[PDB]
Design a protein around this ligand. Structure first.
Ligand SMILES: [Zn+2]
Ligand SMILES: [Zn+2]
Lengths: 21, 30, 30, 21, 30, 21, 30, 21, 30, 21, 30, 21
């Protein structure tokens, strides 16, 4: 998931925004 | 914005900043 | 023996510390 | 809420666990 | 939908997040 | 300046990009 | 509480939160 | 010691508490 | 040319920065 | 103390070294 | 002062503390 | 540069000071 992707690869702020309430 | 390499608590910091007052869910794999 | 205030990014750092792999929600508007 | 319990007021690390999944 | 205040080390953490490899300047006296 | 825009006032992450190189 | 993987300054952050007003000692091996 | 254990292995908050004053 | 205030977790981050391997004590009640 | 010197008042990084072991 | 091993946002934190009100430039290689 | 040196090797606070304004 996002936690793993951001650490093992890279992720964008736009991907992170999907986890906002 | 630039892409990110975020582990551990640094990902939490980033979610805090992106989401602001909306808040967020932190859901690691178990 | 008494507690301190935890606000903003310091509050979500604390949530990450105590919850870790369980995950958490930070919903300040609730 | 979390802000009122822990930022505006004070809370323990045990109370913080109320917000874990 | 409204923004929060970013001060001191929290402000330069935010600059690092949004600028990354581009680099940035933090010049509070300006 | 950055402090006046983002600490004293508030700014968005988009405005923060004004201070990137 | 969950177990922790803490390096560097992250261990200091954790000690700060655990100990609160009691304060703490940070004593790495040399 | 605790600094090394927490980084190379894992440690608990209860172990950390032994370093409080 | 003048200094700022360092409080709470920011103060122990600063102690970690300047002391590192030497270790330090954070004893706010003293 | 450290809080009074560095949080309530201000201190330099040199003064912070007073609290190293 | 002690020598430092600083990656990522930790280097930014250190620059903030060293430089204070002078501010600083963060300039990674691209 | 300094960003890379501090991460792959070590760096001093005095080296960092060269990046202050
Ligand atoms: Zn803070
Ligand atoms: Zn880190």
């Amino acid at each position: 998931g996002i936690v793993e992707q951001c650490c093992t690869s890279i992720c964008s702020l736009y991907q992170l925004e999907n986890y906002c309430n | 914005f630039v892409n990110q390499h975020l582990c551990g608590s640094h990902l939490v910091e980033a979610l805090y900043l992106v989401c602001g007052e909306r808040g967020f869910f932190y859901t690691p794999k178990t």
